[PDB]
Amino acid sequence: HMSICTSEEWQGLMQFTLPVRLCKEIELFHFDIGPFENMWPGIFVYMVHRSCGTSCFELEKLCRFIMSVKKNYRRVPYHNWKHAVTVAHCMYAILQNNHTLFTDLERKGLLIACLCHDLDHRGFSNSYLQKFDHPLAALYSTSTMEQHHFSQTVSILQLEGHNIFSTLSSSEYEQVLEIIRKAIIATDLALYFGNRKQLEEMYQTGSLNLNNQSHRDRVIGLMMTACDLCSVTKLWPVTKLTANDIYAEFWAEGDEMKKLGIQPIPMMDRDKKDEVPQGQLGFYNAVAIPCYTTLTQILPPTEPLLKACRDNLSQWEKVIRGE
Numbered sequence: 001h002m003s004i005c006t007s008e009e010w011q012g013l014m015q016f017t018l019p020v021r022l023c024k025e026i027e028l029f030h031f032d033i034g035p036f037e038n039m040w041p042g043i044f045v046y047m048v049h050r051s052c053g054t055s056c057f058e059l060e061k062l063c064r065f066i067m068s069v070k071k072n073y074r075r076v077p078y079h080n081w082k083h084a085v086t087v088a089h090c091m092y093a094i095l096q097n098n099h100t101l102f103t104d105l106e107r108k109g110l111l112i113a114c115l116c117h118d119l120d121h122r123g124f125s126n127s128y129l130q131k132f133d134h135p136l137a138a139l140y141s142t143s144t145m146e147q148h149h150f151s152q153t154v155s156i157l158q159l160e161g162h163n164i165f166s167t168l169s170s171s172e173y174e175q176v177l178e179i180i181r182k183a184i185i186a187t188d189l190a191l192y193f194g195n196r197k198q199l200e201e202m203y204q205t206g207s208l209n210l211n212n213q214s215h216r217d218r219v220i221g222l223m224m225t226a227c228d229l230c231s232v233t234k235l236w237p238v239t240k241l242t243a244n245d246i247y248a249e250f251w252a253e254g255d256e257m258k259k260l261g262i263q264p265i266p267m268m269d270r271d272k273k274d275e276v277p278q279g280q281l282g283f284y285n286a287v288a289i290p291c292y293t294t295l296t297q298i299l300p301p302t303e304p305l306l307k308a309c310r311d312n313l314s315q316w317e318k319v320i321r322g323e
């Protein structure tokens, strides 16, 4: 079962108008949604309207969907409503800067997949659920949380007056659900490493073809990782504050492991906070930098994401050096 928005919630969203001041702002990659909490659902509607038009979905159905997705995000330190909108905004900026490379169905699917990609996250990693044999890990062997996120997205669409994709043809409805499924699964970081290595191979050899569906799915997969990690592409004070939320969530999981006499990895151990700058250096060098480097190579307009990521890496190097 799913939590449903109240009549007042979606009606309030329907009447919303984005301030003109933010129209130029929202178009940039480094845009931080952080200071505009009350406007987040409205920002999502605005982004949908600019990405695929004002009649892209029935306004009423869209507002119900958005407000219900919001209620099915938990009050965890990081994988919450704020993270969903932040990831959706990064996708909006990638799509706007590469508009015709993607179909109307892909832009529709990807913005919805980004808003739903961590739906009902409990603040626990796939490793934790598998190790402690959680019922969700019994249901899904690999990409446990990601398959749950997709299952929750489908369940929200099935709610009365929430199926934003009902007016698509049977072939189109099936196609968008597959775009959404693969997009959400690709946010499992364990799949990223292999995905990025294959894309680098295809690019260097010159075999990468966006007309080839398998190649297309891999590019979409990398766009998903890039959006999921975009906090590393914001201005340094924003990146720093989000890192506090990221570790608050990891440390809470570590605390749960310590309560059961198990020592967590240093990243999930709050008594190991001095190791954070070196942990971030490793993450930028091994995960974030290659992600945005490959993304810029495939989609040159995404270059500002790589530039901003390199700037934050330098900020982390300064923390390690004592500056």
Ligand SMILES: Cc1nc(C)c(CNc2nc(C3CC3)nc(Cl)c2C)s1
Residues within 6 Å of the ligand: 078, 079, 189, 228, 229, 230, 231, 232, 243, 246, 247, 249, 250, 267, 279, 280, 283
């Ligand atoms: C609670 C979380 N769970 C996962 C799986 C996350 C993945 N995203 C990140 N992970 C890290 C790790 C090195 C500390 N750093 C950054 Cl900057 C980001 C964006 S965050």
Ligand SMILES: [Mg+2]
Residues within 6 Å of the ligand: 117, 118, 145, 187, 188
């Ligand atoms: Mg996730």
Ligand SMILES: [Zn+2]
Residues within 6 Å of the ligand: 083, 087, 117, 118, 187, 228
């Ligand atoms: Zn995420």
